[PDB]
Amino acid sequence: LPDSVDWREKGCVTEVKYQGSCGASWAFSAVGALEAQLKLKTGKLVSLSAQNLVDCSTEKYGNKGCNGGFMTTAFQYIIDNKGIDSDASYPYKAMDQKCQYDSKYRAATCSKYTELPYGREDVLKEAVANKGPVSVGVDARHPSFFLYRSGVYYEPSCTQNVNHGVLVVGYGDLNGKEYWLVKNSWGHNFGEEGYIRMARNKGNHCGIASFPSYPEI
């Protein structure tokens, strides 16, 4: 119903992270979604451990750490593992390590997650507004994406085949162009202080609504 939302205004989004040469966008996207659900229930915003997911949500979950993974099965790990550590106590090192999870430094838990219907930008809008930040995949193969500085991103050669985990933390519009407000994990010098606004309601642009998921506590 609201024409625009931004979950940063509601205190539900952490500092933008830097994944580096490790392709752990899936882990960053997943912890970002859970982070927001943590704040909604607990009142505490704390950066959760992407590295905990890279290291422990591995072969059983169809994830290859720094060679990519799924947010959906990352949520399953946190359910199965009965918690995830804080980034503070299990920080990010941009490589594949042995699983060093420690129940002592558990900062959050996960009960279930929800996978939204394929390519449905309307349902995604509902969830973003009413549930919270949604982990999504995008097609970020194209140099335009790498280079993005500002405004609403539209790449004509963008497919709906997704390779990169991001987190939709809102939506809105700019000069008529409707956008999704997407948190990336490529440091602060990417786009708009770490964020990118990508085309909304333009035939599932770059696959943004192809595989949306969010967790719950």
Ligand X SMILES: Cn1c(=O)n(C2CCN(CCCn3ccnc(-c4ccc(Cl)c(CNC(=O)c5ccc(F)cc5)c4)c3=O)CC2)c2cc(Cl)ccc21
Mode of pairing for the β-strands spanning 84-85 and 112-115: unpaired
Q: Does 211 bind ligand X (CB under 6 A)?
A: yes
Q: Does 133 bind ligand X (CB under 6 A)?
A: no
Burial label for 195, CB within 10 Å (0-12, 13-18, 19+), is buried
Q: What three-state secondary structure class fits 54?
A: helix
Burial label for 102, CB within 10 Å (0-12, 13-18, 19+), is exposed
- Give the range of 32-40, 142-150, 160-168, 177-185 binding ligand X by CB under 6 A: 160-168
Binding mask 62-91 for ligand X (x = CB under 6 A): xxx--xxxxxxx------------------
Q: Does 26 bind ligand X (CB under 6 A)?
A: yes
Of 78, 140, 162, 181, which lies in the binding site for ligand X, with binding defined by CB under 6 A? 162
Q: Which helix (H) or strand (E) holds 27?
A: helix 25-42
Query: CB of 167 within 8 A of CB of 135?
Result: yes
The CB-of-21 to ligand X minimum distance in angstroms stands at 15
CA proximity to 163, closest of 95, 94, 68? 68
Nearer to ligand X, 68 or 194 (CB): 68
CA–CA distance, 58 with 54 (Å, rounded to integer): 7
Q: Does 145 bind ligand X (CB under 6 A)?
A: no
The CB-of-57 to ligand X minimum distance in angstroms stands at 11
Q: Does 114 bind ligand X (CB under 6 A)?
A: no
The CB-of-79 to ligand X minimum distance in angstroms stands at 13
Q: Does 54 bind ligand X (CB under 6 A)?
A: no
Binding stretches for ligand X (CB under 6 A) = 25-26, 62-64, 67-73, 137, 162-165, 211
